[model samples]
Target: SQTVASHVPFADLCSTLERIQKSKGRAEKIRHFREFLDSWRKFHDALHKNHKDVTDSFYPAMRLILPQLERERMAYGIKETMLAKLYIELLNLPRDGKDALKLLNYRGDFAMIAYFVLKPRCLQKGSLTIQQVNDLLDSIASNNSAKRKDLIKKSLLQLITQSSALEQKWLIRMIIKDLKLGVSQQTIFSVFHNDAAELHNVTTDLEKVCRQLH
Candidate 1:
């Protein structure tokens, strides 16, 4: 049994930014993401991997040949509104956005707060791993809407407060689905297997992709 003991730090992904910037063309980019996946798999136990949908998580904005998922939820299983509420509490911003610009004095959305404000904060001892983060978000989808914000805050604060500044930055990005890692679904799918990407292009079904890869 391969049990995961520690969290997968954002430091693991820092190289991805470098790879995206320096590596040119599809092959090189695909190679970069493939390596990321390799490390990602090693960090999580087999059961964790079994529960996650790689294509959907990484490419939530992507659609395959059609609605490929059995569930009607978003790819990450997290709602944007919940993320907004979390930021409001995390940054002490107004839930109603009463300040709009003058008092807030920054971008108007939660994603902007994550990138501009939270990412710049100082470092800490990172306590959460990649699988832990995924698990928290998965649970978020199962609860009622009224309870989601509290649940996110409970789990998310534990992560950002304990994580290094670098870790906090990526955690925020993951919640916002704006990793800016520069790799796309097409690249990751192709790298996962030779035929997976083309098959996914036609089916838009990640479960289908997983089945074929298996």
Candidate 2:
């Protein structure tokens, strides 16, 4: 059994993104994301890393998260957006990035780095697994019809209830699909392998490139 939180560790990604943001050069920034992945692969005691499905599987998940990425991008001091909409629908109260966190009804000290911080809450029990995170997002993305508020709310809280203050911040960013790390597709592809950049030059199909590289 595996979880996305276990393999990726929300805090690790957040710190790497911060490092990438402050980095002065391209190589340094790229290495941050690259090293993070490499370290995860080395420590992840599972068959997922060795399978052909790694690239194809992980990338589709990224794609699934990207379609609404631009419209819903969450950033520091975020006040309005899809996250707010989802929260209002779930809690039946309207909130912006500023006041919405109070609606979470969380009691502990969030103490997370942000334009502002809110002590968010968890109505549910337990933290989220990577698979759980992916599956919930997939469900939300696919359900284009109305009456989707409950499912989305439940899914959001499921992950939130289980996260720490730092992890909570990452969870919010992940929902918005905008880590805002400097690493773009080209940068990430290059880091996957030495030859991935050359392979990408020939074809834009990252899934294909990754599979072939393996």
Candidate 3:
């Protein structure tokens, strides 16, 4: 049996995004992204042949990759400052917390700064699948109450604890809705399908676009 879409690690997607981010040329970026999309297409086809109604097996990954297109209007409510604080709290860095905050103030890349801060403490391996990360993000986005702040913190703590430093960096980027891949949404959509961008523009719904185009 093939690996289910939900079972694919979010790290796999992150690696692809990282590759696209590092690539210098547009052709290289498109090639990397297209390869990733091709894998997803294969998974979608394999799953669809067996199950009649799989809806959007690619939704979890697609939402993460092209966050701007997601139908969910929810925001994570976690900015870079809040995330820096959360990491300090998670690592129990009371005295070193100031240093971490100072590092964040240097203004290179929030995600990269976070990665450096977490590299020493983060687990070597990440266990969360794409589906699990999406579920946690949904939970964090929807919980926007003073009383539920602890719940949000707990959810984020779970993410950082299980994820590797590299994974944490990408997760932070995802939370901020900026992959910094240097690849535009139009490029991604075109790579995904010939009509994906057109359908998305009209529908403003990635689910609908995927369903129709795929």
Candidate 4:
């Protein structure tokens, strides 16, 4: 029998916002405002899929930023925007790219997991917009002998190995989450809470789900 994973919904942030909207005095609202603001910021950064800052940084040219993308990466004095900084340092996408390249072939897991995990962070609810698991689904749907995906995947895996082992673990878990795909963070929570309801589920939740990031 398949068992459920042990992750909890980071929904404390959402519930707090609802409560504030319902009732509050000026002082109380302002105080709680700061707390929820912090949570919003965290959720905002991690889950904003299709975010411009992050997306704009994707270079079709170099595999990754390169040189600056090595061990002791910071010391290399790389320059990037905020999203690039987070993608490289926080998300470890740069390392993940290199690792995928080293494999010289797309790991089935690599295509699927990378698609799910990385795509939604920029969107408002940190989930898919219309479709699900773009890369994995694409891999299954389309066959290209060129195998461009392999290069990307090896680059990613190399990135994970070089940057930090802890991050490597994070990428692993993220890959697993990639297997369990969703459209947005709110959608993920619904799926997490009840699978049957989610598929046939009312999109009433989408209104609660924001559509854009920046």
Candidate 5:
């Protein structure tokens, strides 16, 4: 019998980030990240062995989770204000409307506030694979010209339409490159491999670190 590989959903990563964000205990946070990374590694190994055509690896998801290690120097260009404006434009919210005001004035987490604004309007749960999310993020990051604002809006809209509000919250956080997980990169790298942190420190290359460590 043959088995088909299912791609890891972006939701899984979001859930892992959320859990880690909420947990106060360091051990608990590490456990969540460790499990997610372990599962990803196992899946990568299985896909590599059984599906010769599949070239998927853990790097895409890894970079998203640990954005500091991302070798690509591209900036996403859309910050909180711009993202808020884009969401307002896409949702057709009135400039002075209640939700729009909340989005503009809320002093807390911008992503969380956006979630509240998106909760009622967002219809579908996120179905995007982690790789797909990474690809979209890459596109958004690479398109940096003022003329490319429309392109950025288009990509953000695609993400908003496809993802649940909670997923959107995490996506926003990812776009901002601030997961706010309360977990350190050292802990994440160490969880993946004892040598991971040192390797990353020495080479500053995530792909090399993952490949050699794996």
Candidate 6:
């Protein structure tokens, strides 16, 4: 029998900047995404405005689509073999029982966080008559990757439409633009904070989280 054991992704994402360097002129694009992520900071002048949409969807969007990045070495790639590896890892995570740590270590905690938290948040916070959110979850949990991708994007689009003006800023700012810019390791750190001199080691953070898994 399988059981679930995981936590949320990006409750306060700041930014988990993974560089996707092979697309377009990534330099300017990274700066754009960085600025978009920065726009969420309470310290930013826009603090008086709203940002729940961005808060709700951005990080998880990244987390879910991360494995599809295919362009960067750091990116998760687009091969069936790689995705197959990822899918198997997720199935094992819940069934790992006392050995769940191995699953998390191989899959990247970013992936788990994206799955448990980011993806659910897109379900519209459990407020729906159609229960589209529940349906989306059911679809992905069916363990169908292509279907999962299709439904995930669909749900995120709905969530984006549900966003406020400030939230829209984040949507246009980061997601649409990340692939365009060769968003860098340093730029990702800046997402956590302008003073993120220590944000360079995200994979390291994932490693630590795995070790703590019990």
Which stretches in model 2 have alpha-carbon errors above 4 Å?
A: 1-8, 44-115, 119-126, 143-146, 195-214
For candidate 4, write residues 29-98 as lDDT tens digits: 4444345434433433444442422221111101111212222211211111211233455454555475
Worst 10 residues of 5 by lDDT: 1-10
Off by over 4 Å in 6: 1-26, 42-58, 64-181, 184-214
Cα displacement (Å) at residue 207, model 4? 22
Comparing candidate 3 with candidate 5, which one achieves the higher TM-score?
5
Residues 1-214 of candidate 2 have per-residue lDDT tens digits of: 3333434444455556668767988889877767665555554435465442332234422332232343332222222344545545554555554455554444322223321332344343335545555555555544433446566566565555565555565556555455555557665655665534544364767897889889
TM-score result, candidate 6: 0.27
TM-scores of all candidate predictions against the true structure:
0.52, 0.54, 0.78, 0.21, 0.79, 0.27
Off by over 4 Å in 5: 1-6, 45-50, 53-56, 145-147, 195-214
Stretches of candidate 4 exceeding 4 Å from the true structure: 1-37, 40-146, 176-214
RMSD versus native structure for model 2: 9.0
How much lDDT does each candidate structure score? 0.50, 0.50, 0.76, 0.32, 0.76, 0.35
lDDT of 1 by residue, 103-205 (tens): 2343444444544555444555555554554455455444434455566556555665666655555555555556554556565555766534543474656
Candidate 3 structure quality by residue, lDDT tens digits, 1-214: 3345575777888889889999999999999987777677666667778774454456678788887666673777776777767766676677455556564574547888877777777566888888888888888877754447778888888888889888988988888777888988887767777535543364656787789887
lDDT digits (tens) for residues 4-109 of candidate 5: 1247788888888888998998999988887787677566667667654464355677787877666673877786788778788877889988888888875548
Off-target runs (Cα >4 Å) in candidate 1 are: 1-10, 14-27, 38-113, 144-148, 194-214
TM-score for candidate 1, residues paired by index:
0.52
Distance (Å) between predicted and true CA of 163, model 4? 3.3
Candidate 6 C-alpha lDDT tens digits along 1-214: 0100011222122232333333356565556555545433332223224332222223333432232342222211122233323433433344444344333354223233333422423423322211232233334334234445555445444544444322322333233223223454455545545534444344557767787764
Clashes of each: 5, 5, 0, 37, 0, 2
- Tell me, by TM-score, which candidate is best: 5
Give the CA lDDT, 0 to 100, for residue 75 in model 2.
Answer: 24
